[PDB]
Amino acid sequence: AFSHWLAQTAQERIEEEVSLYGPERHIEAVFSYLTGGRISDACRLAQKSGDHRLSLLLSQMVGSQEVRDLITLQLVDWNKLQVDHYIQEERLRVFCLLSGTPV
């Protein structure tokens, strides 16, 4: 019921930032879509834009706990790899959202 509530609530928020954003702002749209748990229309957007890798990522957002084990070890690896300095924290905050890491 809480989820259906948020579905009702975030309608106008989506309608406002949708004019704001675009495939330029697509990771910001990712953040919004994650905040909504609005995987359906997120995927529909990603496909109408042909965003296959991102669409595949979308299903993984609420996968099994093994998904998060994957992300923990994978990001520990990227830490040992220093790649963040070469990768925008934008996709990285997407990654934190997927991994359940708030900070």
């Binding site: 299903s59 993984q60 099994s64 070890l73 690896d77 990227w78």
Partner: protein, 229 residues
Amino acid sequence: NMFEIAAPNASEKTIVDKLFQRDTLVRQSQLVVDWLESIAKDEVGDFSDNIEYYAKSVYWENTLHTLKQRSMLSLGSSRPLVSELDPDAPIRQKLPLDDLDREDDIRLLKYLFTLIRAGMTDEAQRLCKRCGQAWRAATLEGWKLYHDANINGGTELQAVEGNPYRCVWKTCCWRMAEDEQFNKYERAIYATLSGNLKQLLPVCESWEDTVWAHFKVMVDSLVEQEIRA
């Protein structure tokens, strides 16, 4: 006592095991598939211990070192490369990648491609967590369904497996196949996960592979038919 009828009343694994029990044709199809892939796994054996000597765990090491030297030296390079490690960083960016990178990639693609044409899934996550494609291992999970039965005892794990967005997610893969532009391995694996005949044509050419694919496609189409039923 063949064949049954019911209505959704509990977790979809009820649907699943009903479907498995009810029909014959799919049953012998399942058995002949078990045959062929038992053949496959007998061929496999200890590929685990044998990959002990295939290993590299540096992500796009050549691009790594060359962008490092561009940032690091008096002289950079005149050569275009991704700024991103993304599994779709190049093709999304259209940017090139290095041959040694992509070809050790293709090598591991043989490894796991074969492992999953056999379905050797334990070794599959093994190789994923070797080479750091935990992203790809995640991508592996888009089809395996969802359940839980913790209607009992304390808060205890009966099943937490995946995202129930899978019917539509296979539909998405279906349309990705209609979009094409893939490597052989990804093309084959996901045209497989879709049972897409034309994009499954390229890789299976053996007698065993073609009969195998016949069974795979027909088992899928059937199984989804009585899913929706």
